[PDB]
Design a protein around this ligand. Structure first.
Ligand SMILES: *[C@@H]1O[C@H](CO)[C@@H](O[C@@H]2O[C@H](CO)[C@@H](O[C@@H]3O[C@H](CO)[C@@H](O)[C@H](O)[C@@H]3O)[C@H](O)[C@H]2NC(C)=O)[C@H](O)[C@H]1NC(C)=O
Ligand SMILES: *[C@@H]1O[C@H](CO)[C@@H](O[C@@H]2O[C@H](CO)[C@@H](O[C@@H]3O[C@H](CO)[C@@H](O)[C@H](O)[C@@H]3O)[C@H](O)[C@H]2NC(C)=O)[C@H](O)[C@H]1NC(C)=O
Ligand SMILES: *[C@@H]1O[C@H](CO)[C@@H](O[C@@H]2O[C@H](CO)[C@@H](O[C@@H]3O[C@H](CO)[C@@H](O)[C@H](O)[C@@H]3O)[C@H](O)[C@H]2NC(C)=O)[C@H](O)[C@H]1NC(C)=O
Ligand SMILES: *[C@@H]1O[C@H](CO)[C@@H](O)[C@H](O)[C@H]1NC(C)=O
Ligand SMILES: *[C@@H]1O[C@H](CO)[C@@H](O)[C@H](O)[C@H]1NC(C)=O
Ligand SMILES: *[C@@H]1O[C@H](CO)[C@@H](O)[C@H](O)[C@H]1NC(C)=O
Ligand SMILES: *[C@@H]1O[C@H](CO)[C@@H](O)[C@H](O)[C@H]1NC(C)=O
Ligand SMILES: *[C@@H]1O[C@H](CO)[C@@H](O)[C@H](O)[C@H]1NC(C)=O
Ligand SMILES: *[C@@H]1O[C@H](CO)[C@@H](O)[C@H](O)[C@H]1NC(C)=O
Ligand SMILES: *[C@@H]1O[C@H](CO)[C@@H](O)[C@H](O)[C@H]1NC(C)=O
Ligand SMILES: *[C@@H]1O[C@H](CO)[C@@H](O)[C@H](O)[C@H]1NC(C)=O
Ligand SMILES: *[C@@H]1O[C@H](CO)[C@@H](O)[C@H](O)[C@H]1NC(C)=O
Ligand SMILES: *[C@@H]1O[C@H](CO)[C@@H](O)[C@H](O)[C@H]1NC(C)=O
Ligand SMILES: *[C@@H]1O[C@H](CO)[C@@H](O)[C@H](O)[C@H]1NC(C)=O
Ligand SMILES: *[C@@H]1O[C@H](CO)[C@@H](O)[C@H](O)[C@H]1NC(C)=O
Lengths: 328, 175, 328, 175, 328, 175
C-alpha cells in the first residue's frame, strides 16, 4: 500500500472545554454553591417606581377614594361616569361631605372596583309629600350647602312625612346597582324635626331579597360640624326584577342606578406616579418587567406579572461548570 | 458530574478557548494548534436554551384578587385572607427553589455528558491507531500532519490509511 | 488448539433499537416537542354526560331545591325523610308557596346538604292561646290553602296573642336542627289583624346562644299574590341543651327537629341525566372515569376524581425516542 | 439523551424490529438476520411501567367542598372563595406540567441508557476478538457462524476459543 | 528497558462496592420498594406529650378561657394584666358569672389572642345619674354578689336613668381596645325596674365608626339562676380618635382599655401538660422536635415546626443500592 | 441505575467490605487481599450529605394562623376555613412524596456513577497491560506484586514499566 514513510512519529490530540476567569455560583441538588460559566436571574426584584399608563386604563383617584367618587362627594365630581382598568387610590385621599359609614365597605368597594364603571343613569323616582334635595353645610357644593351628587335627602313636607312606597322595574337586560342609605339623627328632636315620626324605617326589596334598616339615634363624635351619620347600603336588581323602596322617614333615596359590568377591572392603593410607558405588570411600587418567571417586588399585582416569591435571587445556570486553570 | 469528564478526567478548562465550549488542542509534525468543536458546542447550547425558554414561557395574568394589606383589626375573616396568601407564597417559593436546583443539577450533567460524548466519538474514530492517555488526550501512533488533525476534527478521518503504520509503532517495538 | 487455524473470515454484528412509522410528540425539560415511540394521556377531558346512580346515593331533586324540600313546599312533599350522598339540584326547580327569604341561605343549604338527611321528628309543642295551622293561598295544598309541611303559622286567638314561652329539651344523644321563622307583614293593619301587638318579636335561645328577630313591616313586590314575606332561621340544639322559644307575635313556629348526621354527603347543581352505571367520580357535566391522574372536565367534583388542571392534554412518554429508518 | 447511543452513535432505529425494543442485526457466513434482545427490552419496559403506575396511583376522594360557581354578586367573601380555588388550580396545573416534563426527560435518558448498556455488555463479551466500527456495529475478526452469533446474543460466547484466530486476523496482516 | 529476569505471570484486580445484611426499602421514580444500604426518616411522627415551657411564653389557662380572663370572671382574676406567647386553653375551663354571649366570639378571641396582653388601664369614666357597680348572685365575688372585674353594670338612680353621653379621647400613640356590652332583660318589668325606659339603647362610636345595639327582652334558659343575658361588643379606638358612649339604658359600661400590641402571640386548645424543657415547635399533642422537614403529629402548630404532611413515613435513601452476597 | 455498574456488570456487593463504600479485591502471585477506596467513598458520601442538608435546611416558623378544629356547625365561612387547610395539606403532601422519589432515584444513579467512574479510572491507568473480564475485574497481564497492586490503588501505577512484559503475555502466545 503506501511506500516507506521513513519517519514514523506520533501526534497528541487533547480534548477539553472552555473556562472563564469570572464564573457565577448557583445552587444544585447536591451543592448550594457550585461555580458555573454563566447564569441568568429568575427573580425580578426592582420596580421602575412608576405606574405605566399603558396598556391598561389607569384612573388616578387623586384625592378621592372610589366609594366617595361613587356617592358623589362634591370634590370628586370629576369622576362622574368614569371607567378604569385599574383605579389607583391615593393615601392622601380625603372625604369632605356629610359623615357616612358603609356597613360592608369592603364588599362595596370590591364590587364597584371590578365592575369598572361609574356610569350613572338617573331614574324618575317620584317622592310625593316630602321635601327633596336636602343638603348640608358639611357637604358644601360651591358656595352652598350640598350633598352627595348621587343620593337624594328627603325630609318632611310641611307637617308630614308620609309612607313612601315607590317602585322601579328592571326592564333592561343588565343588572342595576342602586346605592341608598338611612339617616341616623343625633337627637330625638332632630328626628322629629326632619322626619316627624319618632322612629323612621327603610325597607328596600326586590322579588328576591329585602333589607329593613331602622335608624339609630344618639351622639357620635363631631365630624365636619355634625354628630349625625348616614349609613350606605346597596341593592342589585337583576333584569326583569323590581325595586320597591318603602319608608317612614330617614330615607336617603337613590336618584337612579349605576350599571354593572363584568371585566378585568380592579382597584389598587399606591402613591406611585403614573407615567407614560407601556408595561403589562403593575405593582403598588410601580410597574415591573415581566420577562423573569418570579418576582420579589410586591405580592400585590395587576396584569401579566411574574409569580411572587420570598427569594430575592434565583440564578439558573446557563453554562457548564467553571474549572479554570490558573490560581485565584 | 455523572459522567466524570468535566472536572473529572479532563483536569481543567481552557480559558484560552474563546470560540466554542468544547474543542481540540493538538500537536503534530506540523506544529501545535487549538480549535473549538462547534457541533458539541451547539448541542450543549441548544439544550440549555430549550430549558431556558420553557422556564420563561408565559407569565399568566391575574386581575381583581383579594386584599393583601389591612389597616384595621378584624379577626376571623381577615385571618383567613392572610393565611390563604401566606400559604400561596410559601408554596410558590418552594416551587421556585426546587425548580432551579433540579434545573442546575441537570445543566451540569448535561454539559458533562456533551464533553464525554465528544471524547468517545473521537475515540471511536481513531480506532486502533491511538491510545487514551487518560487525561482526555489521545496519543496518535502514526505521523499526523495538520490536515490529518483536521480530518479527525471534521469527522472524516480514515483509520485504515494509517493502521499498518500505527499498529507497528504501537505494539511491535521490542516486546 | 485445532491445528493451523487458516479460515480467516470476519462477521459483523450490529446493535440497534426499534422505531415506529407513527410516533407521538411529548414535552421535555429541554424540548417541548420531541417525538417518542409511544405515550399515554394523563388528562381526562370528556364526560359521558350522565350521572351514574352507583355507587353513591344520588337524589334527583326534580323541581325542588333542597331548602324547599327542607321547609316542605307542597310540591316537594315527595322528599320527606329522604337521604342522599349527593342531592342533584336542577336549574328548572321552582318554589311555589308563601314568599320567604333565608338570611344566610348559603350556610343553611350547606349545613343540610352535608348532613345528608331530611329525617324529621315531630315534637309535641304546645302553643296555648293562639290559632295553629295558618295557611295561605300562595301555598296551595291540594284544593286548599296551605303552608310549609314543617312549619306552623300561629295567629291570634279571638282577640289576643299572648306571650308564647315554650321549651323543648334535647335529651337524646344527637344534635337537633330546628328551622323556624318570622312573618314580615305588608301593613300595620295586617300586623294587628294577625298578631294584635303592633310590633311582634321572636327570641329563640339555648343555654349557649340566642337570636331575637323583630319583624319588618312594609310592602315588597307582589309574589304569588302576596307582599309579605317570612324569613327562615335555624337553631341547632346540642345533647343536654334546651330550646326556649319566646314570642310576642309573628312567630312561624317549628313542628319538631331534623336530625343531623356527619357523612360524605353534599349537593351539586347539574342538569345532567342520571343513568344506571357505576362511576365513582361525579362532575356536574356527568360522571368521568378516574383512571387518569388529572382531569379537565370540570372543577366541581364529588367522589374519587382526578385532580382538575387547566391543561386539556398531557402526554407521558412511555417509550424511547422515535428515530425512523425512512418512515413507511 | 445523556448517553448518546439512541439518536447518537446508533444512527437510527429499525422499523423492521417488531419483536422487541433493542436487538441485533448480523451478516455472517450463512447470510443475514435480525433478533430482538428480550432482557434489555424487558428492563426498559419494566422501569417505564413502574413509573407509570406510580403516576396513576390513587385518585384521592373529596366530598362536600366549597362552592365554585355563583349567581349573585356578593363582594368580600365570594372574592376569597374564588381566589382559593383559582390558586389551587394554578398550583395543581404547575405540578402536572413539571411532572410530565421531568418524567419524559427521564424516560428518554433511561431508554438511551438501556441501549448503551446492551452495547457495552456485548463489547465486553467479545473481548479481544472484535472492534467497534463506531456506528454501534462490531467487526468480529474470526469466522462466526450462526451458532456463534447466537452465543453472543444469549451471553455464552467464549472469547478464548477464537482469540488466536482473531488476534492474528486483527493485528498481524502486514504492519 | 525494565528487564523481567524470569517471572511470567498475571494478577487479577476486581472492583466492587459494599453491601449490608440489613438494608432499607425506599420509593423511587421507577420503583416503590427498592432496597438501599441506609435511609433517613423525614416525617416526625411522635410528640413527647408535653408542652415545653421554653423558649416561648406559655400561659396555662387552667380553668379560664381567654375571653373570661379578658372580661374578668372572678375565678379568672389571676390572669389580670397577664401576657403570653401562647395561651393554652383547657377543655375543662368553665364560666361562672353572669350569663353572656359574644356575637363574633371567634373574632374577639382571635384579636386578643394575638395581641398577647391583657394589660388593662382604668379610665375615669364619669357616669352621672345612674347607680354604678351592679353585681349579681350568678357572679359571686368572694362572699358577695359581683360581676366581671373589667365591666361596670349601671342601673337607675332613684327613679331615673338619664341619657348617658360620655367621651374618652385617645391621646396616646397606641390603639385602645374597649370591651363593653348590653343587658338583655327577661321581662319588661325587669327592664323598667333596672333602666326605667321600656326600651334601652347603646350607641358607641368613634370618628370612624358606630354601633347601636338595642336590648332584646324575653326568657332564655335558666343559667346560674338567671334568664337574662348580657352580650359583649368591642371597639378599638386609634390614636387621636375619640370614644363617645351614649345610652338610654341597658349599658354595661367599660372601666378603661386593654392595650393592643403586635406580636407572635396566639392561643391553642390543648390538654397536654406543660413541662420544663426547651422546644421550638408546639403541637396541641405536646412539643415535637423540628429536625425532620415534615411532620405528621398534628396540623395545628405554633413556632418553628416541620410542615404537616398526610404521610406517616418518608425515607430518604442515604446510600447506594443493597445487592448482598447471600440474601435479605 | 443509569450506568449499569452497581447491580449491573458488577454482580453484587461485598458485605465483607467494612472500611469504605467502593474498593478493590485482588489475587496476585503473592496472595489475595481487599482494600476500600476512600476517594470515591468520600465523593459518594459528600454528595449524599449535601443533598441531605439542603432537605433539612430551615423549618420556617408560623405563629397565629387560622382555626383548624371546630365545635359548632356554621356553614359558609367554616367550609372555606376547612377547604383552605385541606388543600394546603394535600399540596404539601404531594410535594414531600415527589421530593423523596426524585431524591432517591438520583441517589441511586449518583452512587452507580461513582462506581463506574472508579472502574473507568482504574481502566485508563492500566493502559495496555490489562483486559476487562467484564465482571468489573481486570486481568493484569504481567507479574504484579503487592506494591504493584498498591500503586494502582493509590494512582501512581506506571504502565510503561510493564508494557513490554504485558504486551508479550497478552498478544503473542501462539496466534
Ligand atoms: C355628647 O358628648 C360629646 C362628647 O362629649 C359631645 O361632643 C362635643 O360637642 C361639642 C359641642 O358641639 C363639640 O364642640 C365643637 O368643637 C369644635 C372644635 O373641635 C368647635 O370649633 C365647635 O364650635 C364646637 O365647639 C365637640 O367637638 C364635640 N366633641 C366630640 C369628640 O364629639 C356632644 O356635644 C354631646 N352631645 C349632647 C347632645 O350632649
Ligand atoms: C307599594 O308599591 C308597590 C309597587 O308600586 C305595590 O305593588 C303592586 O301592587 C299591586 C296591587 O296589589 C299589584 O297588582 C297586581 O298585579 C298582578 C299582575 O299585574 C295582578 O294579577 C293583580 O290583579 C294586580 O294587578 C302589583 O303586582 C304590585 N307590584 C309589585 C311590583 O309589587 C304595592 O301594592 C304598594 N303597596 C301599598 C300598601 O301601597
Ligand atoms: C319561660 O319558659 C322557660 C322554660 O319553660 C322557663 O324556664 C324555667 O324556669 C324555672 C323557674 O325559674 C326554672 O326552674 C328552676 O330550676 C332550677 C334548677 O332545677 C331550680 O334551682 C329552681 O328551683 C327552679 O326549679 C327552670 O330551670 C327553667 N328552665 C329552663 C330550661 O330555662 C321560664 O321560667 C319561663 N319564663 C317565664 C317568664 O314564664
Ligand atoms: C449567559 O446566559 C444568558 C441566557 O442563556 C445569555 O443571554 C448570556 O449571553 C450568557 N452569557 C454569556 C457570556 O454567554
Ligand atoms: C352618564 O351617562 C349616561 C348614559 O350615556 C348619560 O345619560 C348621563 O347624562 C351621563 N352623565 C354624566 C354626568 O356624564
Ligand atoms: C415594594 O413596596 C413594599 C411596600 O411599600 C416594600 O416593603 C418593598 O420593600 C418594596 N420593594 C421594592 C423592590 O420596591
Ligand atoms: C476535512 O478536512 C480535510 C483537511 O482540511 C479536508 O480535505 C476535507 O474535505 C474536510 N471535510 C469536511 C467535511 O470538512
Ligand atoms: C403505549 O403505552 C401504554 C402505557 O404503557 C400501553 O398500554 C400501550 O400498549 C403502549 N402502546 C404500544 C403500541 O405499545
Ligand atoms: C320520618 O321519620 C320518623 C322516624 O322514623 C317517623 O317517626 C316519621 O313518621 C317519618 N315521617 C315521614 C313522613 O316519613
Ligand atoms: C363541563 O361543563 C362546563 C360548565 O357547563 C363547561 O364550560 C365545560 O366546557 C364542560 N366540559 C366538558 C368536557 O363537557
Ligand atoms: C446459546 O446458543 C447456543 C447456540 O444455539 C446454544 O448451544 C446454547 O446452549 C445457548 N445457551 C443459552 C443459555 O441459551
Ligand atoms: C444513615 O444515614 C444517616 C444520614 O446520612 C447517617 O447519620 C447514618 O449514620 C447512616 N447509617 C449508617 C449505618 O451509616
Ligand atoms: C395593670 O397595669 C397597669 C399599667 O402598669 C397598672 O396601672 C394597673 O394597676 C395594673 N393592674 C393590675 C391588676 O395589675
Ligand atoms: C395528635 O392529636 C390528634 C388530636 O388529638 C390525634 O388524632 C392524633 O392521632 C395525635 N397524633 C399523635 C402522634 O399523637
Ligand atoms: C503508592 O504505593 C507505593 C507502594 O506502597 C508507594 O511506594 C508509593 O509511594 C505510594 N504513593 C502514594 C501517593 O501513596
Amino acid at each position: 500500500q503506501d511506500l516507506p514513510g521513513n519517519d514514523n512519529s506520533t501526534a497528541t490530540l487533547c480534548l477539553g472545554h472552555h473556562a472563564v476567569p469570572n464564573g457565577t455560583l448557583v445552587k444544585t441538588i447536591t451543592d448550594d454553591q457550585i461555580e458555573v460559566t454563566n447564569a441568568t436571574e429568575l427573580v425580578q426584584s426592582s420596580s421602575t417606581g412608576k405606574i405605566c399608563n399603558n396598556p391598561h386604563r389607569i384612573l388616578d383617584g387623586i384625592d378621592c377614594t372610589l366609594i366617595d367618587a361613587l356617592l358623589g362627594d362634591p370634590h370628586c365630581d370629576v369622576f362622574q361616569n368614569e371607567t378604569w382598568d385599574l383605579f389607583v387610590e391615593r393615601s392622601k385621599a380625603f372625604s369632605n361631605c356629610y359623615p357616612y359609614d358603609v356597613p360592608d365597605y369592603a364588599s362595596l368597594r370590591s364590587l364597584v372596583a371590578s365592575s369598572g364603571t361609574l356610569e350613572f343613569i338617573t331614574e324618575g323616582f317620584t317622592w310625593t309629600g316630602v321635601t327633596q334635595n336636602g343638603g348640608s353645610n358639611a357637604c358644601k357644593r360651591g358656595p352652598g350647602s350640598g350633598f352627595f351628587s348621587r343620593l337624594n335627602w328627603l325630609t318632611k313636607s310641611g307637617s308630614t312625612y308620609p309612607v313612601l312606597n315607590v317602585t322601579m322595574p328592571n326592564n333592561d337586560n343588565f343588572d342595576k346597582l342602586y346605592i341608598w342609605g338611612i339617616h341616623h339623627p343625633s337627637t330625638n328632636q332632630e328626628q322629629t324635626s326632619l322626619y316627624v315620626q319618632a322612629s323612621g324605617r327603610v325597607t328596600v326589596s326586590t322579588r328576591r331579597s329585602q333589607q329593613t334598616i331602622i335608624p339609630n339615634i344618639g351622639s357620635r363624635p363631631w365630624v365636619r360640624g355634625l354628630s349625625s351619620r348616614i349609613s350606605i347600603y346597596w341593592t342589585i336588581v337583576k333584569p326583569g326584577d323590581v325595586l320597591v323602596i318603602n319608608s317612614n322617614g330617614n330615607l336617603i333615596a337613590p336618584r337612579g342606578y349605576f350599571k354593572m359590568r363584568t371585566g378585568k377591572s380592579s382597584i389598587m392603593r399606591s402613591d406611585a406616579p403614573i407615567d407614560t410607558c407601556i408595561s403589562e405588570c403593575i405593582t403598588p411600587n410601580g410597574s415591573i418587567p415581566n420577562d423573569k418567571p418570579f418576582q420579589n417586588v410586591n405580592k400585590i399585582t395587576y396584569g401579566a406579572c411574574p409569580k411572587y416569591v420570598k427569594q430575592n435571587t434565583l440564578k439558573l445556570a446557563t453554562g457548564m461548570r467553571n474549572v479554570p486553570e490558573k490560581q485565584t | 458530574g455523572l459522567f466524570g469528564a468535566i472536572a473529572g478526567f479532563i483536569e481543567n478548562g481552557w480559558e484560552g478557548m474563546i470560540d466554542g465550549w468544547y474543542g481540540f488542542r493538538h500537536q503534530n509534525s506540523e506544529g501545535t494548534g487549538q480549535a473549538a468543536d462547534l457541533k458539541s458546542t451547539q448541542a450543549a447550547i441548544d439544550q440549555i436554551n430549550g430549558k431556558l425558554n420553557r422556564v420563561i414561557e408565559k407569565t399568566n395574568e391575574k386581575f381583581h384578587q383579594i386584599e393583601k394589606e389591612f389597616s384595621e383589626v378584624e379577626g376571623r375573616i381577615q385571618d383567613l385572607e392572610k393565611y390563604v396568601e401566606d400559604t400561596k407564597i410559601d408554596l410558590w417559593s418552594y416551587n421556585a427553589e426546587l425548580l432551579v436546583a433540579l434545573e442546575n443539577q441537570h445543566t451540569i450533567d448535561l454539559t458533562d455528558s456533551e464533553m464525554n460524548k465528544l471524547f468517545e466519538k473521537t475515540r471511536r474514530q481513531l480506532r486502533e491507531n491511538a491510545e487514551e492517555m487518560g487525561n482526555g488526550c489521545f496519543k496518535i501512533y502514526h505521523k499526523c500532519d495538520n490536515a490529518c488533525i483536521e480530518s479527525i476534527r471534521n469527522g472524516t478521518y480514515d483509520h485504515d490509511v494509517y493502521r499498518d503504520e500505527a499498529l507497528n509503532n504501537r505494539f511491535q517495538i521490542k516486546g
